[PDB]
Design an enzyme around this catalytic site. Structure first.
Site, PDB file in Angstrom:
ATOM      1  CG  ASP A 165      -8.459  35.191  -9.388  1.00  0.00           C
ATOM      2  OD1 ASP A 165      -7.673  34.315  -8.961  1.00  0.00           O
ATOM      3  OD2 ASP A 165      -8.323  35.785 -10.481  1.00  0.00           O
ATOM      4  CB  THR A 166     -12.991  35.647 -13.489  1.00  0.00           C
ATOM      5  OG1 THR A 166     -11.766  36.100 -14.087  1.00  0.00           O
ATOM      6  CG2 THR A 166     -13.917  36.837 -13.253  1.00  0.00           C
ATOM      7  N   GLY A 167     -10.663  33.742 -12.698  1.00  0.00           N
ATOM      8  CA  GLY A 167      -9.859  32.581 -13.021  1.00  0.00           C
ATOM      9  C   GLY A 167      -9.652  31.629 -11.864  1.00  0.00           C
TER      10      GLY A 167
HETATM   11  C1  LIG Z   1       6.601  38.433  -6.913  1.00  0.00           C
HETATM   12  C2  LIG Z   1       5.283  37.695  -6.776  1.00  0.00           C
HETATM   13  N1  LIG Z   1       4.176  38.061  -7.362  1.00  0.00           N
HETATM   14  C3  LIG Z   1       3.118  37.249  -7.091  1.00  0.00           C
HETATM   15  C4  LIG Z   1       1.711  37.494  -7.673  1.00  0.00           C
HETATM   16  O1  LIG Z   1       0.707  36.809  -6.950  1.00  0.00           O
HETATM   17  C5  LIG Z   1      -0.416  36.246  -7.436  1.00  0.00           C
HETATM   18  C6  LIG Z   1      -1.500  37.081  -7.855  1.00  0.00           C
HETATM   19  C7  LIG Z   1      -2.694  36.476  -8.396  1.00  0.00           C
HETATM   20  C8  LIG Z   1      -2.793  35.051  -8.504  1.00  0.00           C
HETATM   21  C9  LIG Z   1      -4.000  34.414  -9.082  1.00  0.00           C
HETATM   22  C10 LIG Z   1      -3.943  33.764 -10.526  1.00  0.00           C
HETATM   23  N2  LIG Z   1      -3.139  34.621 -11.398  1.00  0.00           N
HETATM   24  C11 LIG Z   1      -1.952  34.437 -12.019  1.00  0.00           C
HETATM   25  O2  LIG Z   1      -1.334  33.396 -11.900  1.00  0.00           O
HETATM   26  O3  LIG Z   1      -1.458  35.453 -12.790  1.00  0.00           O
HETATM   27  C12 LIG Z   1      -0.149  35.575 -13.293  1.00  0.00           C
HETATM   28  C13 LIG Z   1      -0.192  36.205 -14.693  1.00  0.00           C
HETATM   29  O4  LIG Z   1       0.433  37.523 -14.622  1.00  0.00           O
HETATM   30  C14 LIG Z   1       0.799  37.824 -13.263  1.00  0.00           C
HETATM   31  O5  LIG Z   1      -0.144  38.745 -12.650  1.00  0.00           O
HETATM   32  C15 LIG Z   1      -0.619  38.212 -11.388  1.00  0.00           C
HETATM   33  C16 LIG Z   1       0.326  37.014 -11.047  1.00  0.00           C
HETATM   34  C17 LIG Z   1       0.770  36.538 -12.463  1.00  0.00           C
HETATM   35  C18 LIG Z   1      -5.327  33.447 -11.219  1.00  0.00           C
HETATM   36  O6  LIG Z   1      -6.121  34.598 -11.206  1.00  0.00           O
HETATM   37  C19 LIG Z   1      -6.121  32.313 -10.588  1.00  0.00           C
HETATM   38  N3  LIG Z   1      -5.401  31.077 -10.686  1.00  0.00           N
HETATM   39  C20 LIG Z   1      -5.864  30.184 -11.735  1.00  0.00           C
HETATM   40  C21 LIG Z   1      -4.991  30.063 -13.000  1.00  0.00           C
HETATM   41  C22 LIG Z   1      -3.590  30.741 -12.896  1.00  0.00           C
HETATM   42  C23 LIG Z   1      -4.914  28.592 -13.458  1.00  0.00           C
HETATM   43  S1  LIG Z   1      -4.731  30.362  -9.225  1.00  0.00           S
HETATM   44  O7  LIG Z   1      -3.601  29.509  -9.505  1.00  0.00           O
HETATM   45  O8  LIG Z   1      -4.225  31.357  -8.323  1.00  0.00           O
HETATM   46  C24 LIG Z   1      -5.938  29.440  -8.441  1.00  0.00           C
HETATM   47  C25 LIG Z   1      -6.680  30.000  -7.369  1.00  0.00           C
HETATM   48  C26 LIG Z   1      -7.687  29.234  -6.727  1.00  0.00           C
HETATM   49  C27 LIG Z   1      -7.959  27.918  -7.175  1.00  0.00           C
HETATM   50  C28 LIG Z   1      -7.201  27.365  -8.248  1.00  0.00           C
HETATM   51  C29 LIG Z   1      -6.204  28.129  -8.878  1.00  0.00           C
HETATM   52  O9  LIG Z   1      -7.623  26.111  -8.496  1.00  0.00           O
HETATM   53  C30 LIG Z   1      -8.678  25.826  -7.551  1.00  0.00           C
HETATM   54  O10 LIG Z   1      -8.853  26.998  -6.731  1.00  0.00           O
HETATM   55  C31 LIG Z   1      -1.695  34.231  -8.071  1.00  0.00           C
HETATM   56  C32 LIG Z   1      -0.517  34.820  -7.539  1.00  0.00           C
HETATM   57  C33 LIG Z   1       3.405  36.187  -6.254  1.00  0.00           C
HETATM   58  S2  LIG Z   1       5.079  36.252  -5.806  1.00  0.00           S
END
Ligand SMILES: Cc1nc(COc2ccc(C[C@H](NC(=O)O[C@H]3CO[C@H]4OCC[C@H]43)[C@H](O)CN(CC(C)C)S(=O)(=O)c3ccc4c(c3)OCO4)cc2)cs1
Ligand SMILES: [K+]
Ligand SMILES: [K+]
Ligand SMILES: [K+]
Ligand SMILES: [K+]
Lengths: 99, 99
Positions: free
Chosen positions: A25-27
């Protein structure tokens, strides 16, 4: 290796003597892993992302192997829907985006 | 360009005739952008993050420019704390992981 992105970039890690699959995860600034058994002392902490925030535990200096490459960093355990390797670790195995 | 990961992978996008700064997220199936003026039809839809779920509008075939590269795909607008470019788009500009 080189990873295209037509499929979630899933790799294989081994932490605490267990094998798991994390998402590269780059994000993510941080490494977050679903509920799991890890030794040593920790700290309460909260992180947020899409949909809200979650209270997680913080572990520092914990050895983790990401798809073959060893690394020692800060792993955060808690109610995340999937395993996530964040830039804090991605940096150690020399991962990069290219296009 | 080879984007290293010691700093969040932020890039310049251009959508809706407007310029924005988005995050290149490999761990993102979809592209999500904060609330904004966007022309054309759409469809309600909920997505799940690390904190929970959010209801976002889904726009299809919306031309967008990511760091100079033109691409056309599905863009979702809603309460996301950050602009996110997802694999659905990254694959469109040849972005890939590598380490
Ligand atoms: C049904 C369901 N499906 C699901 C899918 O499950 C997922 C799958 C992947 C992720 C990770 C997240 N992705 C995300 O929200 O993506 C969304 C956009 O389209 C969709 O495809 C995947 C989930 C969703 C980002 O890549 C990293 N994030 C940063 C961004 C969003 C600001 S973070 O919030 O996770 C994070 C991590 C670590 C950190 C941090 C922040 O801050 C400090 O450290 C979360 C839930 C769940 S329940
Ligand atoms: K491994
Ligand atoms: K350890
Ligand atoms: K641009
Ligand atoms: K358009």
């Amino acid at each position: 290796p080189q990873i295209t992105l037509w499929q979630r970039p899933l790799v294989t890690i081994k932490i605490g003597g267990q094998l798991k699959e994390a998402l590269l995860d780059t994000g993510a600034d941080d490494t977050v892993l679903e509920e799991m058994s890890l030794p040593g002392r920790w700290k309460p902490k909260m992180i947020g992302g899409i949909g809200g925030f979650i209270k997680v535990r913080q572990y520092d200096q914990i050895l983790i192997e990401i798809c073959g490459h060893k690394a020692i960093g800060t792993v955060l355990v808690g109610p995340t829907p999937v395993n996530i390797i964040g830039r804090n670790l991605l940096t150690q195995i020399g991962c990069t985006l290219n296009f």
